[PDB]
């Protein structure tokens, strides 16, 4: 809705947390709306006196409209309950700065995580790249979070490794808004001279017609798999953003990464079917690899839940 829309207001509800129950520990990095911190919050998790959390803030210099948009975005997550999607824990809409309390993902974003693995292997011959089993586990976790979102009628539009997060126990989850690292702004292009678009992750139809659907999210998922298999190299390395636009719309595809397991590349190719409807749904993707997932997946996934 644009012509007739919701008002720019935020009504405090059960998600409101008293600032007295929060403490700031240290800075994590600049987010889209403002500095993000790591901290502690009391009474946000059942049977847990205190919880380590991520705290997103809104720059004190932002307009009231921007503070409202911030809260608006957080509110969308109030209805989410998926192990593979970073969880909203609370909101502080009174006083300054405005804050959103989120589940802490101690290992950061997946792109940064993947890139940090290369130098470690280069320094110790004992280490080897992530096994097929580990890559499949990540694939299923990401696919599960996306299947959950799609089931609730939501599309991502910017699915990429930089927007997936890694937990303390290495579980990968779909990240929350305004967390993309500043250094990855280079992953976006002013297509046609308009807004910033993640062209190297976009489907042919998104590039050509400007439409995004669950089908296009699946296309991006394919690119995320490619990122996992390449330890986050830049897709279409030898092409400028403009060249990528043409290459992909004309049916071009990313090359199979070196040493990439056959089954992983085959999944990529299915995610990159030119015709959107020919791509598998996230549920179909999971069904094709569920036998290779960790036993614990059956217990925490949306896939095996009663909601599916």
């Amino acid at each position: 809705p644009e012509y007739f829309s919701a008002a720019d207001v935020y009504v405090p509800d059960e998600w409101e947390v008293a600032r007295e129950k929060i403490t700031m520990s240290r800075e994590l990095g600049q987010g889209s709306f403002g500095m993000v911190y790591e901290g502690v919050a009391k009474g946000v998790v059942k049977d847990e006196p205190e919880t380590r959390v991520a705290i997103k803030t809104v720059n004190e210099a932002a307009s009231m409209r921007e503070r409202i948009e911030f809260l608006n975005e957080a509110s969308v997550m109030k209805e989410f309950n998926c192990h593979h999607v970073v969880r909203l824990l609370g909101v502080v809409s009174q006083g300054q700065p405005t804050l959103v309390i989120m589940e802490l993902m101690t290992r950061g974003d997946l792109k940064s995580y993947l890139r940090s693995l290369r130098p470690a292997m280069a320094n110790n011959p004992v280490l080897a790249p992530p096994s097929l089993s580990k890559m499949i586990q990540m694939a299923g976790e990401i696919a599960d979070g996306m299947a959950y979102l799609n089931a609730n009628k939501f599309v991502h539009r910017d699915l990429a490794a930089r927007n997936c997060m890694v937990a303390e126990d290495f579980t990968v989850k779909i990240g929350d808004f305004g967390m993309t690292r500043d250094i990855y702004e280079t992953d976006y292009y002013r297509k046609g001279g308009k807004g910033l678009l993640p062209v190297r992750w976009m489907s042919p139809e998104s590039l050509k017609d400007g439409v995004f659907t669950t089908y296009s999210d699946v296309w991006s998922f394919g690119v995320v798999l490619w990122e996992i298999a390449t330890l986050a190299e830049q897709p279409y390395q030898g092409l400028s953003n403009e060249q990528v636009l043409r290459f992909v719309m004309e049916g071009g595809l990313l090359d199979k990464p070196d040493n990439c397991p056959d089954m992983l590349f085959e999944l990529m190719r299915m995610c990159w079917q030119y015709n959107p409807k020919m791509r598998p749904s996230f549920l179909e993707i999971i069904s094709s690899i569920k036998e290779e997932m960790e036993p614990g997946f059956r217990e925490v996934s949306f896939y095996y839940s009663e909601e599916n």
Side-chain angles (χ1 to χ4, degrees), residues 176-226:
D176 50 310
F177 80 92
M179 289 292 290
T180 317
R181 286 187 67 185
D182 48 26
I183 61 170
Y184 299 134
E185 188 174 3
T186 181
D187 288 2
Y188 302 79
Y189 166 55
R190 293 286 188 177
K191 184 171 180 294
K194 294 182 180 59
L196 293 174
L197 293 175
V199 302
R200 291 169 195 275
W201 283 262
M202 290 168 63
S203 73
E205 70 268 20
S206 293
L207 293 168
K208 183 188 304 299
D209 305 318
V211 298
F212 293 70
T213 64
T214 182
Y215 309 146
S216 58
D217 275 349
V218 167
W219 172 285
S220 299
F221 174 78
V223 181
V224 175
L225 293 184
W226 188 89

Side-chain angles (χ1 to χ4, degrees), residues 23-40:
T23 62
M24 311 294 249
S25 299
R26 65 191 182 83
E27 292 183 354
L28 292 184
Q30 191 63 48
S32 302
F33 287 92
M35 185 63 226
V36 180
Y37 299 77
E38 179 182 316
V40 180

Side-chain angles (χ1 to χ4, degrees), residues 27 46 77 85 89 97 103 107 115 169 223 229 291 304:
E27 292 183 354
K46 193 70 178 63
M77 305 184 82
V85 179
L89 294 177
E103 171 182 4
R107 297 181 189 289
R115 290 190 167 183
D169 69 2
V223 181
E291 297 306 307
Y304 289 91

Side-chain angles (χ1 to χ4, degrees), residues 144-155:
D144 192 62
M146 290 303 304
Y148 174 77
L149 289 172
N150 287 177
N152 284 284
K153 303 185 183 62
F154 288 100
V155 293

